[PDB]
């Protein structure tokens, strides 16, 4: 026995949510809380001091933004409860919580303590009847409806590649990199001070993030493309100010393939990705050549998959046809896939009742992990 | 509380108090005054 569950597609930057069997996440709001810088002695103005969404984005000025979650590992768990309480807002739910099944998201390569504390929240502070969350890549595959695939997510500062054969991942061939657009914008901030500009405020930095997402693409041959002169079509701020560009429009996003240039013993998404592919079956790579699942919204770049095709030619196999799946609802793919799963009578076997948590809890977490 | 309002015998009364206690578990989700909570504790003692 249950109610209609809700799929909460936790984007590393923007969390999303929405009831079962639907097509579009009901809510789409980010992951940070602002608190006012200035206080007042005046009587009659606003209250709250904790805002997320249009309230925060509305009056960004005093609300000092702080991202509580880092690579899934959140440190403001209490504030996450407040965030989920905000998910239970009047404008948000007006529903109950201890009487409905739900669905959140889970990326791999994580400490169990996160799931442990999560169960503590939803089953100590809440009394959720049944709830089970699994690997996000399968949800993307649900959106595809394709047995095998190479899913690559793209969070704000989180990325990971997973190959799955008919609903079976490869634990010995799954990789992850701790970065996405987060340090890309931070690196753009670096470029800003490289040519003398600081955008040290939190909101200011998110504005920089929006600028990045607004004007950035991929180049063909980076060192050869460096030989030209960027004309820097200046954009003009909401404040009304000159915005130069530099190589940032193409150089800054390729930091992903130059972690040594940023200071990290890593190689590249496609590099370690194809390495894990090499660790897979001699035969399944053939399937994965056409089964290339693109996911995550950080992927929005001109010639993104095209430069990725160039990367494929860099890591060329022994002449075998390859194909990439590049949909348009890559962020929504996981939410919709969960909605598909949430629209299944198979969750009876795929769930864990709260009574099970009452009986064991931690042991149910360890044993009934997946 | 309607269970105690219609309480008849030891088994029903006792188990009703058990269910009452399980509902009393909402303090972690309410933050109600400790002293007023104690008033309720002895109130239930008087009711019992």
């Amino acid at each position: 026995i249950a109610n209609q569950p809700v799929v909460i597609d936790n984007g590393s930057g923007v969390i999303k949510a929405g009831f079962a069997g639907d097509q579009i996440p009901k809510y789409c709001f980010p992951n940070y809380v602002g608190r006012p810088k200035h206080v007042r002695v005046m009587a009659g103005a606003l209250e709250g001091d904790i805002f997320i969404g249009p309230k925060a984005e509305e009056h960004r000025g005093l609300l000092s933004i702080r991202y509580p979650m880092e690579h899934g590992i959140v440190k403001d768990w209490n504030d996450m409860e407040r965030i989920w309480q905000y998910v239970y807002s009047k404008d948000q739910l007006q529903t109950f919580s201890e009487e409905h099944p739900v669905l959140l998201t889970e990326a791999p390569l994580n400490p169990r303590k996160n799931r442990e504390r999560a169960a503590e929240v939803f089953f100590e502070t809440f009394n959720v009847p049944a709830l089970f969350i699994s690997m996000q890549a399968v949800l993307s595959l649900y959106a595809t409806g394709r047995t095998t695939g190479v899913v690559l997510d793209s969070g704000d500062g989180v990325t990971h590649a997973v190959p799955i054969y008919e609903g079976f991942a490869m634990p010995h061939s799954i990789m992850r990199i701790d970065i996405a657009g987060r340090d890309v914008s931070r690196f753009l901030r670096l470029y800003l001070r490289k040519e003398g500009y600081d955008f040290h405020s939190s909101s200011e930095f998110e504005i920089v993030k929006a600028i990045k997402e607004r004007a950035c693409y991929l180049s063909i041959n980076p060192q050869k493309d460096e030989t030209l002169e960027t004309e820097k079509a200046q954009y003009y701020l909401p404040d009304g100010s000159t915005i130069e560009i530099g190589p940032s429009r193409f150089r800054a996003p390729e930091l992903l393939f130059r972690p040594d240039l940023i200071g990290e013993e890593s190689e590249g998404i496609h590099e370690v990705l194809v390495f894990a592919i090499q660790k897979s079956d001699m035969d399944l790579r053939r399937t994965l050549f056409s089964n290339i699942v693109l996911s995550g919204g950080s992927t929005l770049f001109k010639g993104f998959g095209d430069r990725l095709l160039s990367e494929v030619k860099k890591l060329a196999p022994k002449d075998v046809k390859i194909r990439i799946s590049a949909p348009q609802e890559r962020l929504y793919s996981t939410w919709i896939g969960g909605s598909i799963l949430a629209s299944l009578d198979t969750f009876k076997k795929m769930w864990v009742s709260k009574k099970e948590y009452e009986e064991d809890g931690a042991r149910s977490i360890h044993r009934k992990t997946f | 509380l309607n269970d105690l309002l219609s309480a008849t015998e030891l088994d029903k009364i006792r188990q009703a108090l058990v269910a009452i206690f399980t509902h009393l578990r909402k303090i972690r989700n309410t933050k109600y005054p400790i002293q007023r909570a104690l008033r309720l504790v002895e109130a239930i003692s008087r009711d019992l």
């Binding site: 693109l294 990725l308 494929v312 030619k313 075998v320 390859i322 194909r323 590049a326 890559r330 | -």
Partner: protein, 37 residues
């Protein structure tokens, strides 16, 4: 209103506008197939 209030003291923007103003002015295509043969 404050009309007799205005009759008492003289600090009223009489025959003058109270507002001044700076006037008006006039996709992800899939199938990236690396056909390697």
């Amino acid at each position: 209103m404050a009309d007799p209030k205005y009759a008492d003291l003289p600090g009223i923007a009489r025959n003058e506008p109270d507002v001044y103003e700076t006037s008006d002015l006039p996709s992800t295509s899939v199938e990236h197939i690396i056909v390697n043969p």
